[PDB]
Amino acid sequence: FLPDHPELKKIKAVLQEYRLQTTLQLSMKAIQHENVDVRIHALTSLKETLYKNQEKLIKYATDSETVEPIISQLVTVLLKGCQDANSQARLLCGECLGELGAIDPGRLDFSTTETQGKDFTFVTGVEDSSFAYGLLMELTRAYLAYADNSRAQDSAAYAIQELLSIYDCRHQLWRRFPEHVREILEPHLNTRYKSSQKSTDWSGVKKPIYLSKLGSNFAEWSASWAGYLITKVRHDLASKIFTCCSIMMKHDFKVTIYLLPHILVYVLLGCNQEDQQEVYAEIMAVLKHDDQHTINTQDIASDLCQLSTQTVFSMLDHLTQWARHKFQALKASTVDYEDYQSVTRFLDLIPQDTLAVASFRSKAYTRAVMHFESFITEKKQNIQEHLGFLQKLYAAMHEPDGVAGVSAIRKAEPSLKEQILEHESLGLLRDATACYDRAIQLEPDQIIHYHGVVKSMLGLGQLSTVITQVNGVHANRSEWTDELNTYRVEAAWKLSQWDLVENYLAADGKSTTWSVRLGQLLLSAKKRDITAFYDSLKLVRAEQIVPLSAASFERGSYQRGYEYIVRLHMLCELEHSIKPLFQDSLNWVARLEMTQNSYRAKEPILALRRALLSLNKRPDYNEMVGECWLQSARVARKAGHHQTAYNALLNAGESRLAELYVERAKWLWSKGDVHQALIVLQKGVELCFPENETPPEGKNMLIHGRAMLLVGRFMEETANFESNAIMKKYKDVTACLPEWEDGHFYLAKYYDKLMPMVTDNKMEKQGDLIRYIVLHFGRSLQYGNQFIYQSMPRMLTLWLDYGTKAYEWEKAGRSDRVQMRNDLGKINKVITEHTNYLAPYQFLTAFSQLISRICHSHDEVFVVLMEIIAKVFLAYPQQAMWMMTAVSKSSYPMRVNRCKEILNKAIHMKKSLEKFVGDATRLTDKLLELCNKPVDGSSSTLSMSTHFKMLKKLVEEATFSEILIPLQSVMIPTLPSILGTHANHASHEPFPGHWAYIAGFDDMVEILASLQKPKKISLKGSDGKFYIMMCKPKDDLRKDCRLMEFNSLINKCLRKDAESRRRELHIRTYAVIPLNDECGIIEWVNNTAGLRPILTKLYKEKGVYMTGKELRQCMLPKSAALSEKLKVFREFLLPRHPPIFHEWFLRTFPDPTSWYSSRSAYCRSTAVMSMVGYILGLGDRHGENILFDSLTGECVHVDFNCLFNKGETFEVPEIVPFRLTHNMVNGMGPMGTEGLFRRACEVTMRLMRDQREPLMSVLKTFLHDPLVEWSKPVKGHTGEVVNEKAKTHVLDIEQRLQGVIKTRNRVTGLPLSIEGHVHYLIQEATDENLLCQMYLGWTPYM
Amino acid sequence: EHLGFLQKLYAAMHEPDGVAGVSAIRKAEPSLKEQILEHESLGLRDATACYDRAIQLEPDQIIHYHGVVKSMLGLGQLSTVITQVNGVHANRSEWTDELNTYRVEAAWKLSQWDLVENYLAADGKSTTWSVRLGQLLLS
Amino acid sequence: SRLAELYVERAKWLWSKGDVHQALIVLQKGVELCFPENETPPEGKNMLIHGRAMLLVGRFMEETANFESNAIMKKYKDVTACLPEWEDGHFYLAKYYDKLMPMVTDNKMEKQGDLIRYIVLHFGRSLQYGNQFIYQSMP
Ligand SMILES: CNCc1ccc(-c2cc(-c3nc(-c4ccc(S(=O)(=O)C(C)C)cc4)cnc3N)on2)cc1
Ligand SMILES: CNCc1ccc(-c2cc(-c3nc(-c4ccc(S(=O)(=O)C(C)C)cc4)cnc3N)on2)cc1
Ligand SMILES: CNCc1ccc(-c2cc(-c3nc(-c4ccc(S(=O)(=O)C(C)C)cc4)cnc3N)on2)cc1
């Protein structure tokens, strides 16, 4: 009902008698409602609400890295609604989004959009009840659909009767159909019907049905071809059904659509060679014909070409699915084999290349790519001649990486047009401009070249030149002037030359360009035209929504359509800026900040805002325009395009801004001319902040602080400057903005860098320095959590290490002990103050490390540590308990005693925690028992009740406390965003989301042969969902746990970065929880299977398979020379296993769109994981350890025990960076490594290099972790262990991040590589010499 | 106080070092004109955008269009130069006479002889090196 | 008609920018595009361009850290073979041998001997064919 008014308040008193986030959920549920008017009211109310609660909404969006979950759900819902049929609803929902803002897909989270689609219900045959049922539903919806012809509804009910003839509903058949269909079909289900139409013979008329009078119209062509076919099929039941539905077919084409596929299947089963040739003729004709290619009266044809293409495609698709299912049957008789053979033969008759060309004609890009790769492989056809078509395709799809790959592959020199394609897809547009000029010289009669020239000009921002260029072109040719008018319009309105806008607009009444529409709106604003304004507003909103409509029906849709979403954002902002003029609550700053960080996103919004400000007449507009030009800088500077803001860095101009200087400095710094930047910056500082008068006020003090900090950083970079001056500058920055975090942070970093040098690397001397360091770090934290990941861990490491060294010196008998002791006391006091000031979650973030050092030797240090950990525990008992469990049950007694001390202190602080602690202890003990429960016999499945009674009971008791199901989402804390820093540090919610407590266990427990017989359990969550948790004996997971943490941090990074996001790079992460050193519980990842098993099944299906003994024969002695091994490999192992993985892709995903999306995801995921592994030195990537999700196609890695180049230590050393066997490559597609995969690798590598500091700090903490079983277990168990290769491991990790291979022999001085790094890595992985050496277990041949 | 004058001088002397030094000395922010001068003295890409902003600031000045056309020349964008001069002419007939030299140079470089002849015919007052070269080549 | 020349000058420009790797790839592709091993390039100027390209690839390799010493050495030797009388080949080969010697010999001249003989001989021949690097070579 969703009333919103006092009358609605009467209804609400009613609802109270019956019984912002709340209202939001309500409106959400509303919009989903079926009644269109219901939804419309919902949407209107929602739009108003959003406008009214804009403040709280923005706060939700920007307070924390990730948006409030409710927001994510709401945006998913709105984008869905975009798909709705009613135009009004679509427009309303577009307004919804635009009002929300253009949230960076990163900040949003889409797990709801599983989008299975309820599709792929391939029907094996007509006989199948479900298929005949769908046919009956078709006919019923048909007869009801139209009353225009009594004969037609009569034909549908007649087919109902004939279906009763084929099979009686009276009771499975009746059971099959629903009641809204049941009651509709019942009146004629039994009555009777005369033949709806007079008999006609499609076979009598002989002609290619396409291009025939009957085939003139699409539906009529559907009617003539299907009738002919029905005549053709030699199937009595098929003939019966076909005749039954014939009459209905004449009236509605859609019934024809449903029927044709199986009609063809039956025609294939019962075949005449001449009939087969005629069928292939019809299909080829439909495919061969290009509506633009052939000339005829197009009233029928225009629609006919497209529709017929789609129909033939669908028919072939059903044929393919039928053939695959029949091959599965055959493997699982002879008549079915013959039928399947006939169908496969007909399929073969069709040309893949033809299919691809047609598809491309029909804009069915994805299917085109699929067909084209299928062609390039199925029939081997060389490297070099089809590249043009494939490149054009990728261009269409807008997949840049496709174009880049295609280029990377082409051997022959690239044609000019191809270089144009490449520069457009990805290029600085400078080469683009010059190539355009050269094209104009090469071709003087093509408009598109001038298009590109003008577009480039605009990009650089040379408006006036663009206007004049358009005018010139106009002078040369009048006709082109119409097409080119758009860019002139854009320049004008951005130029703020309204009159020119009016002229050019009046000139053309045929341009639908976004730019032209924007100019129209701005004009209607300039000259107050309320009615026209709002009309154009509706129109443009609809237009924009159009593309997003199709975009919605896809995974990751939001991202794919983000451009249009930003357009809607601009529209909303424009509306709210204009309204007051006609007769502006929105907060522009926050809005902009929510947007993704890339040109495509920010720039257009900013230009539009400059325009609006121009239309607005406010005194401060002159300066606001400077802020907008300066806001364009740091939105482009970050991207590159350094000339793309000359008309910005200059444009800013008048508005007084030391900010102008700071910006010019950052720019120079990006460009590499550091000394320049320092000069310009010192000058701007002197000028804007003369020493005589202090800047004490607001933005002035702020900018002064920022400038001083930047000066300091520059000075650090330059080698000339003295340490002391740097330290002084940083201290000054701190003094001028004590509240700022960056100040203290950089100060601490610099002191840290200096300390090793000043102290000679002697801890004793370092003490005082360490105090200063930790103090400033903690302060920085207290202000903001931007650099938390680098700050916290470093501080903790330093303090704890100093404590350890002091304990050693006290035990030693060395004089420095007393000074060290006083220093340590001071340090501990500092830590205490930090504890008091810092919020709990901030410690939570390194809680892992904290726990790691629980066994520290010095008691005072331990007291402090315990205070910290206890504060945390109280703050977040669930996560803390999970993380501490293992240590609790450690075999080492000291670990257990200390953890118990901690828990006791906590309990003392908050009693209620005691009950929960006891419950958790009991639950963990029982789970450990289970994990270690010995299986008897095969015992594939064991009932919970039969064996694990105590567990079911314990969970059953109502007294038992709720235990949060361990899940990565609930373990990895989120953090407050920089934008919002007020009271966020105090009230920040670490784990905003849905918390599922353990409500019970499904009875059945699975035991898996592989993985050393690990039990698999399924917990039952409070929400009712079931989560499957594998229980693993004999594995130390601590390593895996911390690695998962690091992966989560990497995932955050990947999400924030534009380039990674657009590709949707992400590392699949599964929660891991160690019950104790030997046993831990690991979350299951469903729909996923190992590469080895999958390919093994494929091979067996192909009949080609290698026996284990065969392999043993192929195996050779390790001492054998490399030549013999390479031989064995190439000669036998590679031959035996041909590349088939692409087939797995094909079968798993039938639909072209799903196929393409999943293939892309596969490439991206494998790339990301390979890079990450090579950085972390992941090893043992053997078939089973790597996995692929059947649902998305992504790749997931497991068995992260082998880390930090432990593989080399193996008897058979691992000599490859990551697992890239020929099969995986084949998977990626014909392009192979080159293409998507390469670009993903490169992007991931770049990102990692950028965040090198935070990752490196975290990894440091990880490597020096004492709890981790770095070595073999000794005696079964100070409860501390030290990793001997720690320093070496950190050095190697750093180098790899640096990009310094250091492998080079005979010369150890090597400049870092950049992309050549990814290239050399790929080469190494691919090389056969290496692989052949690799151990058989890795199954390199596969 | 007098830095503008010294910069102008060094510009006249064709002494780039002078202008660079001036710029380095100035405390105040550089005006757009002085910026144009410095760009021109010390070698073109940045100067094109500066010229664009200039034109936007003052439309009537012809020197700015001169600079933009020259730049487009240096980069090798002949065709663009032709179209640009043509557009300017469309807007202002007068300017066409001063700008004809660039068009002629472009053409002659394009090898488009008809355009060379026609443009050279347009006006008979240019003595620019480029214009004489075009006359010779056409002959 | 100047494919080889094209790719070579291009590699040079690219290097100028700094993307050494993108240079090496394009250059190797060109080496395959023209003078493609199917038959030995003896065609005079063609042989010259072939040698120039080979030497360029060799110096590139030297720049990149991945490539092994032996391969670089072999490439320089190939350039030497291709053009016996071209100084550049000999000079660069000598330079690379010099740089390698200290590590190979562990900085023990005794072992350094034979390498020294090779190096000196190649310097000398380089001098016979030209005088571009005399100041580096002779001393
Ligand atoms: C018109 N006369 C001047 C001229 C013009 C072009 C050339 C030329 C052509 C090639 C060439 N480039 C590639 C290549 C390039 C880029 C990428 S990329 O991934 O960065 C992404 C940007 C695509 C990947 C591969 C592959 N094969 C090739 N044959 O190299 N130089 C030489 C002279
Ligand atoms: C209207 N346009 C917007 C706008 C306005 C002003 C600024 C601005 C002003 C200054 C500034 N520069 C210098 C300086 C010194 C030496 C050279 S140099 O020739 O040696 C070099 C080519 C190597 C160049 C410049 C000296 N004092 C200064 N105050 O820096 N940025 C930036 C954008
Ligand atoms: C020395 N360290 C020992 C060690 C060993 C294993 C792990 C481990 C395992 C998983 C994990 N595996 C799967 C999984 C695995 C295989 C297949 S399979 O079809 O190929 C067929 C072979 C069953 C299907 C699914 C799903 N979800 C998961 N979380 O995670 N960690 C960790 C440490």
Q: Quick check: A1316 and C3 CB within 8 A?
A: no
Q: Which of A1144, A1137, A1141 is nearest to A1342 (CA)?
A: A1137
Q: Residue A1081, SS3?
A: strand
Q: Is C74 on the interface with A (CB under 8 A)?
A: no
Count the Cβ atoms, other than its own, within 10 Å of residue A766: 22
Q: What does the block give as tokens for A658? A: 């030391």
Q: Quick check: C21 and A1315 CB within 8 A?
A: yes
First CA to last CA distance, chain B? 53
Q: Residue A1275, SS3?
A: coil
Q: What does the block give as tokens for A1159? A: 């293939």
Give CA–CA dist A83/A92, Å, rounded. 12
Q: Which residues contact A1138 (CB under 8 A, 6 or more apart)?
A: A1102, A1104
Give CA–CA dist B22/A1314, Å, rounded. 39
What is the SS3 assignment for B36-50?
A: HHHHHHCCCHHHHHH
Q: Is A1326 on the interface with C (CB under 8 A)?
A: no
Q: Which of A1076, A1011, A1008 is nearest to A1041 (CA)?
A: A1076
**Assign residue A461 a region: left if phi > 0, alpha if psi is -120 to 50, beta otherwise?**
left
Give CA–CA dist A394/A425, Å, rounded. 9
Q: Ligand 1 centre and the CA of B101: distance in Å?
A: 36
Instruction: Report yes or no: A95 and A572 within 8 Å, Cβ to Cβ.
Output: yes
Q: Which residues pair with A707 in a beta bridge?
A: none
Q: Which residues pair with A1073 in a beta bridge?
A: A1081
Q: Which chains touch B (3 or more CB pairs under 8 A)?
A: A
Output Rg (C-alpha) for chain A, integer angstroms. 35
Instruction: Report yes or no: A1061 and A598 within 8 Å, Cβ to Cβ.
Output: no
> b/e map of A168-193 (b: 16 or more CB within 10 Å)?
ebeeebeebbeeebeebbeebbeeeb
Instruction: Report yes or no: A747 and A737 within 8 Å, Cβ to Cβ.
Output: no
What is the SS3 assignment for A33-73?
A: CCCHHHHHHHHHHHHHHHHHCHHHHHHHHHCECCCCHHHHH
Give CA–CA dist A807/A858, Å, rounded. 6
Closest chain B CA to residue A652: B53
Q: Which residues contact A385 (CB under 8 A, 6 or more apart)?
A: none
Q: Which residues contact A394 (CB under 8 A, 6 or more apart)?
A: A369, A400, A401, A402, A403, A405, A406, A425
Q: Which residues contact A289 (CB under 8 A, 6 or more apart)?
A: A210, A211, A305
Q: Ligand 3 centre and the CA of A1197: distance in Å?
A: 9
Q: What are phi and psi of A196, to 5 degrees?
A: -60, -35
Q: Which residues pair with A497 in a beta bridge?
A: none
Instruction: Report yes or no: A1216 and A1209 within 8 Å, Cβ to Cβ.
Output: no
Give residue B5's identity as a one-letter amino acid code: F
User: Looking at the partner chain, which of B55, B78, B87 has a beta carbon nearest the beta carbon of A441?
Assistant: B78
Q: Which residues pair with A1189 in a beta bridge?
A: A1088
Give CA–CA dist A486/A870, Å, rounded. 65
Give CA–CA dist A571/A100, Å, rounded. 12
Instruction: Report yes or no: A616 and A577 within 8 Å, Cβ to Cβ.
Output: yes
What is the SS3 assignment for chain C?
A: CCHHHHHHHHHHHHHHHCCHHHHHHHHHHHHHHCCCCCCCCCCCHHHHHHHHHHHHHHHHHHHCCCCCHHHHHHHHHHHHHHCCCCHHHHHHHHHHHHHHHHHHCCCCHHHHHHHHHHHHHHHHHHHHHCCCCHHHHCC
Give residue A495's identity as a one-letter amino acid code: L
Count the Cβ atoms, other than its own, within 10 Å of residue A344: 18
Q: Residue A239, SS3?
A: helix
Q: Transcribe A836-857 into DSSP letters.
A: HHS-HHHHHTTHHHHHHGGG-S
Point out the ligand 1 atom lying closest to the alpha carbon of residue A1239.
19
Q: Which residues contact A745 (CB under 8 A, 6 or more apart)?
A: A776, A777, A780, A786, A787, A790, A791
Q: Which residues contact B92 (CB under 8 A, 6 or more apart)?
A: none
Q: Quick check: B80 and A469 CB within 8 A?
A: yes
> What does each C-alpha distance from A798 to A444, A469, A794, A824 come to in angstroms?
70, 64, 6, 11
Q: What are phi and psi of C106, to 5 degrees?
A: 60, 20
Indicate if the alpha-carbon torsion angle A321, A325, A326, A330 is positive or negative: positive
Count the Cβ atoms, other than its own, within 10 Å of residue A1015: 22
Give CA–CA dist A707/A703, Å, rounded. 6
What is the SS3 assignment for A951-968?
A: HHHHHHCCCCCCCECCCH
Q: Is C65 on the interface with A (CB under 8 A)?
A: yes
Instruction: Report yes or no: A457 and A449 within 8 Å, Cβ to Cβ.
Output: no
Q: Is B61 on the interface with A (CB under 8 A)?
A: no
Q: Which of A898, A909, A916 is nearest to A872 (CA)?
A: A909
Q: What are phi and psi of A580, to 5 degrees?
A: -55, -40
Cα A1136 from chain centre? 37
Indicate if the alpha-carbon torsion angle C49, C53, C56, C62 is positive or negative: negative
Q: Which ligand number lies closest to the CA of residue A1086? A: 3
Q: Residue A1125, SS3?
A: helix
Q: Which residues contact A1272 (CB under 8 A, 6 or more apart)?
A: none
Count the Cβ atoms, other than its own, within 10 Å of residue A431: 14
Size of interface A-B (CB pairs under 8 A): 87
Q: Ligand 3 centre and the CA of A1011: distance in Å?
A: 7
> What does each C-alpha distance from A1040 to A194, A1202, A1279, C13 come to in angstroms?
73, 9, 20, 48
Q: Which of A933, A936, A935 is nearest to A925 (CA)?
A: A933
Give CA–CA dist A301/A290, Å, rounded. 10
Q: Which residue has the tokens 């979650």?
A: A841
Q: Which residue has the tokens 């105590």?
A: A950
Named by the residue before each, gaps in chain B exceeding 2.5 A from C to N are 43
**Residue of minimum CA distance from atom 7 in ligand 3:** A1199
CA-based angle A1202:A1206:A1210, to the nearest 5?
105
Give CA–CA dist A386/A396, Å, rounded. 16
Instruction: Report yes or no: A283 and A174 within 8 Å, Cβ to Cβ.
Output: no
Output Rg (C-alpha) for chain C, integer angstroms. 16
Q: Which residues pair with A1001 in a beta bridge?
A: A1019
Q: Which of A372, A373, A421 is nearest to A395 (CA)?
A: A421
Cα A127 from chain centre? 42
Give CA–CA dist C91/C131, Å, rounded. 10
Cα A971 from chain centre? 21
Q: Residue A148, SS3?
A: coil
Q: Quick check: A1315 and C22 CB within 8 A?
A: yes
Q: How was this structure obtained?
A: cryo-EM
Instruction: Report yes or no: A722 and A758 within 8 Å, Cβ to Cβ.
Output: no
H/E stretch holding A1021 reads strand A1015-1021
Give residue A393's identity as a one-letter amino acid code: L
Which residues in A lie closer than 8 A to residue B56 (C-beta atoms)? 463-464, 495
Give CA–CA dist A139/A161, Å, rounded. 11
Q: Which ligand number lies closest to the CA of residue B19? A: 2
> What does each C-alpha distance from A135 to A14, A140, A143, A242, A396 come to in angstroms?
47, 9, 13, 11, 37
Q: Which residues contact B126 (CB under 8 A, 6 or more apart)?
A: B97, B100, B101, B104
A649 lines ligand 2 (CB under 6 A): yes
CA-based angle A1212:A1213:A1217, to the nearest 5?
135
Q: Quick check: A1301 and C63 CB within 8 A?
A: no
CA atoms in the 13 A half-sphere facing the CB of B101? 15
What lines the ligand 3 site, CB under 6 Å? A 1008, 1010-1011, 1035, 1070, 1082-1085, 1088-1090, 1093, 1184, 1187, 1198-1199, 1201
Count the Cβ atoms, other than its own, within 10 Å of residue A656: 11
**Residue of minimum CA distance from atom 3 in ligand 1:** C6
Long-range pairs for A335-343 at CB < 8 Å and ≥24 separation? A339/A268, A339/A269, A342/A268, A342/A269, A342/A271, A343/A265, A343/A268, A343/A269, A343/A319
Size of interface A-C (CB pairs under 8 A): 49
Give residue A515's identity as a one-letter amino acid code: S
CA-based angle A779:A725:A663, to the nearest 5?
75
Instruction: Report yes or no: A647 and B53 within 8 Å, Cβ to Cβ.
Output: yes
